[PDB]
Design a protein around this ligand. Structure first.
Ligand SMILES: Nc1ncnc2c1ncn2[C@@H]1O[C@H](COP(=O)(O)OP(=O)(O)OP(=O)(O)O)[C@@H](O)[C@H]1O
Lengths: 88, 393, 396, 55
């Protein structure tokens, strides 16, 4: 009798022990996608920053060419608008 | 640890939850009921049943799969349900993967009858490679890291209370209150019917309403009074003579008719009180049938089954508040209050998972958890030999 | 690691599949390869089968591995995939004598996974990746997950995936996919064509199809300012049409909203549900049709917005006219809103975002393959450790 | 161009199989299928890209 209860007690003890183990070990589907998002955001910050730099560089090159002689299209339709006012 | 994975199926009284042991969330959850169509056609699936409801075809009928005991009811239909899951949600032959299922704690009386039927289904009909069945409240306590626990199942189809002492479901102390989610759904429907247009195919529509706007209502409109509404009301009136939030209004749109329903706080509280004072429902109920005294009863009976002083200190410091209904705001605190009233000499320690999702599927998660242990042999895994033995003379 | 030119991203779909071997280094671009998802099967003596890129001797059968986004014949599917992979291997090998000295060396593989695939389907697929194509770098992203990055990363949002014969409804909460709520509707772009055929039964199916594709076709709420307009046919014919060019979409849209409502109503944490409703994302080739997205928003809006029902609001106002505090409700949504697009991808800005899901994959792809850890993908090592099961160690 | 040899050249390893397996402590009276480290036609041609390019 006594040992039968003790067996049961240790059985459930080990059950709980395996459970509490996995509570710290597991790391689940949600853990992956959450980390991916945090990761992705930093990728966008760097990649986004690089894109901004590239756009700035292109603008700088265009400005330099003009001196030697979105807004890249706004100025074309704006100067074309004005051009058309003069053409007409 | 082990090279395995499995199918977990929880036939709840309202929701059937099923999925793979590989994942945190269930593969799918469908209503524990189905639409029978005529030749014989069985509809399973949340959206599918909704679509059937939209059809409104004469002859469609709703049948549940789980009885008042939390046990399988229409076994032939049960076959069809599981078959459905294996073909459309799990999408795998039932013969390849292992199956772990569960059931609520009972008094043990139907254990053998149920196992016989399961062996017939699992082995004789589905050829399931291996079979195991576990106790839900037990699993819940275990997932909480508890060896002893007072499981308070504030769910639908009644309220289950299961005292667990040293990993032992005290079957004699296990009680199953007839009051729960379903009851409240009925009361809500009946109380709000006065504000709704007009105040079996019809019953199929009842199911629809229950699965939709009624559920929406109870998710936010209901609230549990901190104290006994009656005494609390008096208290505020006393204080008024010496602010009273009970007059505060809450709003809810009745989607299908596009109209605003407005209730005061007291009324919201009135619904909650039915679980504590069922004698206010009608003359068919006793004061002892409220959750307060039911709990006390089961606590005391647990003491009777084995050193009451210690038993009370044990159960009252390992209280698990769970079940879907437990999400009604304030419910948890009210349980604490009821416990302090009936056990003012004991320190109370309760537990409750703040994530709504976790509670809704906690039974499944418990099964999930047990299904994921590395010491394979701990479970009472069953095979064809057990079906055979049973049928051997 | 990893060479930009060696990163392979493959996106399967019920019609065609997008393939993009290599990235554009500096920026992101629109996938240049597009291959019809079909393969031929020859029945030989006693049912023995071969697979072909064409119909050998007019004896092979036309097989379509994917149906409505779901794999119906995984044997055929992996054969289809195999063909693609070796196609690009030979393509680059012929284009570059030293291809195996660089870009065809270490090749990262990103496969976009349609949610309908079963657990066993996925296992078999990973098995072929490592044991047939012998690829030592595998990611099988959830399609919806990819989409959530493209929209400047969202925590709570919806993915509406419009297919051709099916539409998928996905809800994302806390960046996780709620699989038990995710569903699908047996309706898609083709149903538009079907209704248009019904509408104009005397037209050729191609007239209808090409019209759908045409800029004169539009979902309304300056060709909209004209009673009639025209469109040039595939044969160079001038097709003239009236307001029928604005019809045939509501049936699809209504059914979409039906499931959207039902699905979102089952989110447990209403605080998060409120957040979800303010970030709706719409993807799919058909969604490129102008005004479609706005109409879908509008339909969702009028059928779910929690706001004091028209007349009742006017009764507050009526009684006031004889300030009324906002009539708050415990329900949701109180705000329904489409998610905001990133303004940092000119190429995609120019192309339109109907295929943006690929972009999301591209973005996260460089996030993953420029990172020092391999935390989220299957390596040969991991494959050796768990077999196909390794996927659920890294499962997203 | 033999696509199989291209595979042997690209990306330059224990294989598994899906089959029955019997649990053991000892062996238990039941079996299930899983990915076991195993015991140790094709598409036949190559697709003509340039026909599948967005140009
Ligand atoms: N937001 C909510 N808050 C509280 N209760 C809810 C909420 N939404 C749904 N419910 C109730 O929860 C019920 C389902 O809960 P649950 O699955 O715990 O019951 P059950 O598991 O079927 O009962 P049992 O545990 O005996 O199987 C639904 O019937 C519904 O009435």
């Amino acid at each position: 009798r006594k040992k039968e209860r003790n067996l049961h007690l240790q059985k459930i003890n080990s059950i709980i022990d395996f459970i509490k183990e996995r509570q710290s070990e597991q790391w689940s589907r949600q853990e992956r996608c959450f980390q991916f998002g945090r990761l992705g955001a930093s990728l966008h910050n760097q990649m986004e920053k690089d894109e901004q730099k590239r756009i700035e560089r292109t603008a700088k090159q265009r400005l330099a060419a003009l001196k030697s002689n979105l807004l890249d299209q706004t100025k074309d339709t704006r100067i074309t608008q004005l051009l058309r006012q003069t053409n007409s | 640890t082990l090279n395995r994975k499995c199918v977990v199926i929880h036939n709840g009284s309202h929701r059937t939850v099923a999925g793979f042991s590989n994942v945190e969330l269930p593969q799918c959850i469908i209503p524990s009921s189905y639409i029978k169509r005529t030749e014989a056609e069985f509809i399973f699936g949340t959206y599918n049943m909704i679509d059937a409801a939209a059809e409104k075809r004469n002859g469609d009928e709703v049948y549940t799969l789980v009885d008042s005991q939390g046990l399988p009811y229409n076994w032939d239909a049960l076959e069809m349900q599981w078959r459905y899951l294996y073909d459309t949600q799990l999408k795998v032959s039932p013969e390849e993967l292992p199956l772990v299922i569960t059931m609520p704690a009972t008094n043990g009386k139907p254990d053998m009858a149920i196992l016989e039927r399961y062996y017939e289904l699992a082995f004789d009909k589905l050829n399931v490679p291996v079979f195991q069945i576990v106790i839900e409240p037990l699993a819940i306590a275990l997932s909480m890291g508890k060896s002893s626990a007072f499981v308070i199942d504030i769910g639908a189809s009644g309220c289950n209370v299961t005292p667990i002492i040293d990993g032992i479901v005290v079957k004699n102390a296990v009680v199953r209150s007839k009051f729960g989610g379903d009851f409240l759904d009925f009361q809500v429907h009946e109380r709000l019917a006065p504000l709704i247009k007009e105040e079996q195919k019809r019953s199929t529509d009842v199911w629809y309403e229950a699965s939709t706007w009624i559920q929406q209502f109870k998710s936010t409109m209901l609230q549990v009074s901190e104290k006994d509404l009656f005494e609390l009301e008096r208290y505020y009136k006393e204080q008024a003579d010496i602010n009273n939030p009970l007059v505060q209004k809450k709003n809810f749109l009745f989607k299908p008719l596009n109209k605003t329903l407005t209730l005061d706080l007291k009324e919201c509280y009135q619904f909650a009180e039915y679980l504590f004072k069922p004698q206010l429902i009608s003359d068919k109920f006793s004061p002892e049938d409220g959750l307060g005294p039911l709990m006390a009863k089961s606590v005391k009976k647990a003491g009777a089954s084995i050193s009451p002083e210690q038993v009370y200190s044990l159960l009252l410091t390992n209280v698990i508040i769970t079940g879907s209904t437990s999400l009604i705001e304030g419910m948890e605190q009210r349980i604490i209050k009821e416990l302090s009233i009936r056990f003012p000499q004991y320190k109370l320690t309760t537990f409750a998972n703040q994530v709504m999702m976790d509670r809704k599927i906690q039974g499944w998660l418990g099964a999930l958890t047990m299904a994921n242990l590395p010491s394979w042999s701990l479970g009472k895994w069953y095979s064809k030999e057990d079906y055979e033995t049973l049928k051997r003379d | 690691p990893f060479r930009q030119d060696s990163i392979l991203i493959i996106y399967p779909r019920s019609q065609t599949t997008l393939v993009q071997f290599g990235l554009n280094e500096e920026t992101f671009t629109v996938p240049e390869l597009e291959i019809p998802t079909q393969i031929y099967r020859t029945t030989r003596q006693d049912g023995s089968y071969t697979y072909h890129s064409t119909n050998k001797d007019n004896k092979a059968e036309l097989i379509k591995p994917i149906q409505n986004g779901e794999i119906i014949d995984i044997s055929a599917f992996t054969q289809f995939l195999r063909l693609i992979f070796v196609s690009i291997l030979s393509d680059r090998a012929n284009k570059n004598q030293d291809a195996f000295e660089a870009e065809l060396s270490n090749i990262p593989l990103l496969l976009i996974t349609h949610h309908s695939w079963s657990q066993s389907d996925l296992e078999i697929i990973t098995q072929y990746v490592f044991e047939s194509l012998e690829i030592n770098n595998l990611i099988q992203l959830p399609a919806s997950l990819a989409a959530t990055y493209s929209m400047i990363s969202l925590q709570n949002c919806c993915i509406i995936d419009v297919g051709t014969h099916h539409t998928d409804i996905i809800p994302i909460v806390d960046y996780a996919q709620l699989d038990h709520l995710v569903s699908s509707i047996p309706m898609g772009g083709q149903s538009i064509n079907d209704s248009l055929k019904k509408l104009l039964p005397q037209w050729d199916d191609d007239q209808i199809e090409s019209l759908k594709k045409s800029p004169i076709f539009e979902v309304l709420s300056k060709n909209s300012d004209l009673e009639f307009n025209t469109f040039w046919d595939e044969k160079g014919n001038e097709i003239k049409v009236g307001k029928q060019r604005f019809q045939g979409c509501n049936n699809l849209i209504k059914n979409i909203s039906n499931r959207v409502g039902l699905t979102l109503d089952n989110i447990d944490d209403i605080n998060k549900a409120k957040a979800v409703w303010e970030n709706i994302i719409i993807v799919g080739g058909t969604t490129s049709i102008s005004g479609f997205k706005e109409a879908l928003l509008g339909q969702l809006l009028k059928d779910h917005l929690i706001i004091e029902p028209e007349e009742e609001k006017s009764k507050r106002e009526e009684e006031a006219k004889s300030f009324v505090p906002t009539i708050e409700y415990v329900q949701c949504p109180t705000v329904i809103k489409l998610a905001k697009y990133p303004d940092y991808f000119p190429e995609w800005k120019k192309s339109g975002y109907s295929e943006i899901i690929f972009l999301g994959a591209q973005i996260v792809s460089k996030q993953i393959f420029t990172h020092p850890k391999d935390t989220f993908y299957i390596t040969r090592e991991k494959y050796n450790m768990k077999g196909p099961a390794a996927l659920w160690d890294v499962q997203f | 161009m033999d696509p199989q040899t291209l595979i042997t050249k690209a990306n330059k390893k224990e294989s598994w199989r899906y089959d029955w397996y019997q649990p053991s402590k000892e062996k238990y009276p039941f079996r299930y299928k899983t990915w076991l480290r195993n015991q140790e036609e094709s598409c036949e041609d190559i697709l003509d890209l340039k026909e599948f390019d967005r140009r």
